[PDB]
Design a protein around this ligand. Sequence first.
Ligand SMILES: OC[C@H]1O[C@H](OC[C@H]2O[C@H](OC[C@H]3O[C@H](O)[C@H](O)[C@@H](O)[C@@H]3O)[C@H](O)[C@@H](O)[C@@H]2O)[C@H](O)[C@@H](O)[C@@H]1O
Length: 812
Amino acid sequence: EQYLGNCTAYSVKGNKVVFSCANNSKIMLQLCSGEVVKIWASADGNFVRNNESFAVIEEDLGWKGNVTVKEEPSTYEIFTEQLRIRVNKAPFQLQIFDKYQKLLFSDYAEKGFVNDNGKIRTNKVLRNDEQFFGLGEKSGNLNRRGSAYKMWNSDQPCYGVNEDPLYKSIPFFMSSYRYGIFFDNTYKTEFKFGSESNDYYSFEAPAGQMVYYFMFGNDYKEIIQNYIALTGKPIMPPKWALGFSQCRGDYTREDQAREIAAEFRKRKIPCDIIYQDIGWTEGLQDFDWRKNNYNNPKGMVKDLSDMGFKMIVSQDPVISQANQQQWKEADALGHLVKDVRTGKSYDMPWPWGGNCGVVDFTKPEVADWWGSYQQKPLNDGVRGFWTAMGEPAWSNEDAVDRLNMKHHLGMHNEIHNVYGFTWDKVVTEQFYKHNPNKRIFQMTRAAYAGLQRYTFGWSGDSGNGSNVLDGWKQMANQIPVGLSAGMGLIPFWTCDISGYCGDIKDYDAMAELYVRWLQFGVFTPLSRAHHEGGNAVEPWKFGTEAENISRKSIELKYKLFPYLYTYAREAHDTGLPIMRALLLEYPNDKETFKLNGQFLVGKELLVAPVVEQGAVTKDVYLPEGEWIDFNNCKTKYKGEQWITVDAPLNTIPVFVKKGSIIPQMPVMQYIDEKKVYPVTFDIFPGNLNKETSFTFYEDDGESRDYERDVFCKTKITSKASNEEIKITVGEREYKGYSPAGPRNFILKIHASNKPKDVFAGGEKLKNVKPHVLEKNIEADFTKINWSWNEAENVISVRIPDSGKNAVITIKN
Ligand SMILES: OC[C@H]1O[C@H](OC[C@H]2O[C@H](OC[C@H]3O[C@H](O)[C@H](O)[C@@H](O)[C@@H]3O)[C@H](O)[C@@H](O)[C@@H]2O)[C@H](O)[C@@H](O)[C@@H]1O
């Protein structure tokens, strides 16, 4: 095996510096910004790759001018505003320090880059206290330190608590030393975080180029901001995607869709999306509504739409050979992935429809061809897709025959991990082309880094297939799977609520596990119940107790829509997931590295779902601050401690941070059932002299105008001083979208005692009964008054949403 060895010279080309080392080897450092360094180590010095990055869309992160290199007798030095770089000459070693000269990131000995006949590896010093997070949608504990992980998009049904690899490959990790690494290679990469030795960690590939990006941040938020500068801002879903969604393996019929739609509405269980699974289509993959299964598909979609339901349909990436018309068409056009042994279309087995052709979404002409096929259901009013089985399915590491696949852009060993990625990109591109100024809904199984530009995600076929009742630990692991997916830029994520696997032979016995799965599930952005085949898992199937609890779980998510939607926008702007590992908000608190049983939803809410069988309590770690029970709003706790709370079956432990302001809407059966509604702001005043706020984001929820910053925002501020609370409703920040109106705001200030008076500006407001404050809340927009509820300990202040600044002063 070959190392860089001694560096004899350097050359600068603008923001790029190339160091020449032993036997034609070279290494480039490229300053994308003061914080982000592109590093390319090359065994032969040529700096070419078979394919340019599929993930990186921007390398200019604002670096100005040339890289300045200072030569010393035994080292070279490069300074940026945030970094100090030391390059040892003999032998080549790269070391990166922060501006205070603390070491962040160092090559291990002489083995910083290792080449062995095309196998490429990077070895880095591993510090005793260095922890690691990320690598996308992967199982096990949040903290990756001590374990090894592989990138090979795999199809592992009913996967275990530690199964790896899974369906997606996002080679972006973060270190507790406050940098991220994105290893910009699509082959079967492997990451070993001290799993081989305590002295070093490594990342490697069997082929391709050693190209990786070092992304410094002063915290994890900055690292993620740097990552989306490189790989793109997340697209937002249509607003209605943040409701509740329902699926089943057999959701492939008009009669059943009509039956289920009616049942949801009759039982007043809110729901926005009815999915259809893969059997909806006449064959793989013609996008024709199966004739026996749908009498009037247009009518169905419209009738469901009139009831507030949107429909999302499945697609697989293959054409069945039995689908003779489409297969022959595809094969004759050269649109199928080839077999290098024959030069002909690769002959792929598939679990349904017989052997198939794998559609080559890396071939440019395939895009418009697929686009025209997939548009058919969209012309009937379907709102998007779930793209399943793009690993491709049935192509795990041991299925070595797949390596014979030859795609337009390369061989399968290179293209496997971007097969689904390039498919998903086509789906979204073609959607944009044929459906003007509309947000796509796409939710995918297989993916690569950068997916956030095109698609959302779900965690595939989870749960226990031998006995559905034994899936508790698998359900529990969906917490860190989802948080890790979030850190890998899947902010719009869900899992199969109930799991995918296991026949439900006894609905009474399954009720507890279902209820807990849904309680967790409603705090995932794309909350979707689904199950294999004919195993019905709608929220009323588990008896009345479970139904009532599940209705309430779902109702809580709907009430929180304006809160959640504000964080959906924040995902677009900053890359931060809605579901946040506590470490993202409390990076200095090392206890957060251990937390696999709880998470933040945005910044204000801490959710700690019960995921243990028979449990009626929950252990919860509270980070810095003070924390209030969001269910009752009365019980308060000090931060930086472990507590145990009562958590019976009907209860989700949720806490609100003291100081928070939470926008909410009334219960509705689907998003926008009421196109205009009063917005309540639940305000939990912070400590004396501490100003807090929430910026309530709104936009049209459907178009791409938000990508051009067409929206409005309303900032609500709270600040307590001596026997006084000031609540400010900020002047509406108008950027080309006017909110639904006219409407009222209700400021709901949580307080121990009824105050003396409440003022709006200089003017004293009228105290009235709760009933009077509530009267004509959706019809009269001229009343400004306040009320007290002693039972709830809440001051309500009614005020029209005029769009103007208003200062509400509460005299304690
Ligand atoms: O011809 C056999 C069969 O074909 C269709 O059903 C296929 C299949 O559909 C569901 O499973 C699809 C499944 O794909 C991946 O695993 C995803 O990850 C899952 O989310 C997704 O549900 C169903 O669950 C299976 O039971 C079913 O075999 C027709 O619909 C069938 O009528 C027909 O028998």
